[PDB]
Amino acid sequence: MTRLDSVERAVADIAAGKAVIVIDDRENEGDLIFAAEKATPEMVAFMVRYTSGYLCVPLDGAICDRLGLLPYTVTVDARNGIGTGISASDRATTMRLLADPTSVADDFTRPGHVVPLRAKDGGVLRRPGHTEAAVDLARMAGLQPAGAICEIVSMAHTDELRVFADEHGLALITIADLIEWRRKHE
């Protein structure tokens, strides 16, 4: 039985501009998660090092509506003030722009190097996904409702995640504990 951090500690990490690891038990894997507005070259570089592939930016529905994605096919880069879009610093800039409450589709170009995702209203109480968890944590940290997530390159699995989390000072939580915390403190 591997130690899980409290939701309160994960929220505090998010608020301080740090990352956390979130496990679900849908699929049963770990995503690295930070708040999109907190993206830096250093944190994106860190995420790039351990991503299985894509870096995604979960966004609240209102943000998606504003940007024009209603209801991976869609990738974006910031239109201005970047290189080709793939550097850690370019991706960080793209991430921050997606969290900026005045960004519009015009501020971005497609295709690009960051994947926006639409979180279900209600967050993990509605759909217990990593996408919703990332938005929930940012919102709980008092930040714009916009996260940055990747699946970490792949019990023994939850064990290795605990060591990895500790080596980098990250909180490790489950979506179940997040659902439970939200039910109680909301």
From Swiss-Prot:
Q: Where does D-ribulose 5-phosphate bind?
A: 26-27, 31, 127-131, 151
Residues of the site described as Essential for DHBP synthase activity? 113, 151
Which of this chain's residues are annotated to bind Mg(2+) 2? 27, 130
Q: Which domain of life is it from?
A: Bacteria
What protein is this chain from?
Riboflavin biosynthesis protein RibBA
Binding positions (Mg(2+) 1): 27
The text of the family note is:
In the N-terminal section; belongs to the DHBP synthase family. In the C-terminal section; belongs to the GTP cyclohydrolase II family.
Q: Which cysteines share a disulfide bond?
A: none
Q: According to its UniProt entry, what is the function of this protein?
A: Catalyzes the conversion of D-ribulose 5-phosphate to formate and 3,4-dihydroxy-2-butanone 4-phosphate.
Shown segment, full-protein numbering? 1 to 206 of 425
* Organism for this UniProt entry: Mycobacterium tuberculosis (strain ATCC 25177 / H37Ra)
> What gene is behind this protein?
ribBA
Please give the residue ranges the record annotates as the region DHBP synthase: 1-184
